Ligand binder design. Structure first.
Ligand SMILES: Nc1ncnc2c1ncn2[C@@H]1O[C@H](COP(=O)(O)O)[C@@H](OP(=O)(O)O)[C@H]1O
Ligand SMILES: CC(C)NC[C@@H]1CCc2cc(CO)c([N+](=O)[O-])cc2N1
Length: 252
């Protein structure tokens, strides 16, 4: 197909929750558009200064005139990106739809129990889980402090629309997961939505986006809980990111 000059603006809004293939999608979108895609990894590795901006945004977003102030902040944060995935953005998908009226919406989904088990190993271990101590240690090596965890928890609460949330309760999380995914499919016009099951790969995505399947490039498969466990252990061992970054080429 012909090469065309794509606009550097948000073209794709992904509503999928963490641990649903969002980093693979981020990588795939960057392969298609040759511009960056937002993801929690963007905050952790490139823009930790964004953390307080997202926290402020979530704080203001329970609240027209104040709507515009928030929408402007949302635009500032996403400037120069061509897509959004993952926390903290995914909870804002309805607002992003208004701000970027020509952007299409994706929903990444998977088996709810596989999701919960992935989440527990990586994002939200039970507070009695000894692994949680390793996660906290690896996080410190990356320079992630209490404000990062606050942003993580608050943006999940915001996505699930729940003033508080027993994070140690599987049944609660499973119910929020199903309800969240259900509400996305109800809220977004089917013309504007593509639902992607883990493992679907390039074809339905590229069709939806009217682009050619990348030549000879397999659809990304990254950010497994096994890989994140290795990253955590390596961070603990070497006490820096830069010491090991060459060992995780596509992941980061
Ligand atoms: N192309 C692909 N095919 C199958 N699973 C994939 C995949 N890309 C990512 N995943 C899975 O999606 C999860 C990561 O999602 P996210 O990037 O949103 O955190 C991981 O699940 P597991 O932890 O169960 O291995 C990872 O294995
Ligand atoms: C030791 C290091 C690997 N820990 C970082 C971890 C794993 C990556 C990660 C990803 C997300 C969302 O994709 C969130 N989140 O939901 O805020 C938190 C974290 N925290």
């Amino acid at each position: 197909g012909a090469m065309i000059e794509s606009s550097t603006t948000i073209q794709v809004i992904s509503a999928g929750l963490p641990r649903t293939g969002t980093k693979s999608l981020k990588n795939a979108l960057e392969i298609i558009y040759h511009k960056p895609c937002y993801h929690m990894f963007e905050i952790i590795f490139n823009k930790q200064s964004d953390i307080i901006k997202w926290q402020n945004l979530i704080h203001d977003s329970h609240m027209t005139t104040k709507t515009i102030a928030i929408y402007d902040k949302l635009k500032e944060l996403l400037d120069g990106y061509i897509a959004t995935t993952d926390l903290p953005t995914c909870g804002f998908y309805k607002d992003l739809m208004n701000i970027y009226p020509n952007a299409k919406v994706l929903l990444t989904i998977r088996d709810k129990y596989d999701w919960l088990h992935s989440l527990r190993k990586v994002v939200l271990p039970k507070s009695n889980d000894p692994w949680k101590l390793k996660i906290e240690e690896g996080d410190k090596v990356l320079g992630l402090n209490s404000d990062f965890y606050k942003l993580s928890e608050d943006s999940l609460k915001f996505a699930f629309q729940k003033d508080d949330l027993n994070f140690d309760d599987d049944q609660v999380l499973l119910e929020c997961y199903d309800e969240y995914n259900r509400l996305v499919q109800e809220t977004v016009p089917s013309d504007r939505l593509l639902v992607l099951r883990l493992g679907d790969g390039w074809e339905p995505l590229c069709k939806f986006l009217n682009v050619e399947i990348p030549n000879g490039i397999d659809y990304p498969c990254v950010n497994s809980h096994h890989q994140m466990t290795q990253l955590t252990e390596q961070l603990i061992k070497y006490k820096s990111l830069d010491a090991i970054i060459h060992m995780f080429p596509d992941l980061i």
